Structure formats: C-alpha cells, structure tokens
Amino acid sequence: LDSEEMKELHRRLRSYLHQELDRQAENRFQMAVDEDYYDSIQWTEADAQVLKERGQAPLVFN
C-alpha cells in the first residue's frame, strides 16, 4: 500500500515539516539561546575572544 499514495503523502509531510522548521527557525533559535543563558552561558564567541585578548577571564553573573 506504500507505493501508490503513501509516497505522495510522505513527500507532502516532509514539505510541511520543512516549512514549519524554516518558519520557526528564528523563534527556535531564540528559545535555544534563552535556555543557554539559563545555565550561566552568556558570552558570545566574538566578545569572549575580545575578553580573552584583554587578558580578562569572562564572568557570568546569571
């Protein structure tokens, strides 16, 4: 039964999944970054490198 129509259904579902993934990419990224800031990880890589060149160890107050 898979060949006749379930291939079309699977293609449709994959397209819908791609659309909902790319539509929510910004919000998904924002929620991920929020969860990262929860557990005392609050320095972006660029500014952390800037601090490292300063000789200053990055600090998180959280």
């Binding site: 991920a32 969860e35 990262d36 929860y38 557990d39 005392s40 990880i41 160890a57 600090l59 998180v60 107050f61 959280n62």
Partner: protein, 49 residues
C-alpha cells in the same frame, strides 16, 4: 536475576544543562565568582604591600 527490568544504580539528578543534558552541580557560577574573588583579594593585598 532481579524481576524489575531497571539498572541497579539509581541516579540522583541535579541541574541538567539544556544543550546536552549533561548534569552540572550548584557550584559552576559561584566557582567563577569565587575565583574572581580570590584574584581581587590577592591583587588588593599585593597593591597594599
């Protein structure tokens, strides 16, 4: 032999990191602040001396 189908060792979890679900204790942030405190105290003592 045990009837229950679970491991003998039971994990008492703590704070779990969101990114990788790797457990981390209370210490981390206050450890950072503690090392900063030690640096500040040593620097102040050196400047005074």
């Amino acid at each position: 032999p045990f009837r229950h189908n679970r491991f003998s060792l039971t994990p008492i979890w703590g704070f779990r990191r969101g990114r990788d679900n790797l457990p981390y204790g209370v210490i981390r942030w206050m450890r950072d602040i503690q090392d900063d405190i030690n640096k500040r105290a040593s620097k102040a003592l050196y400047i005074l001396s």
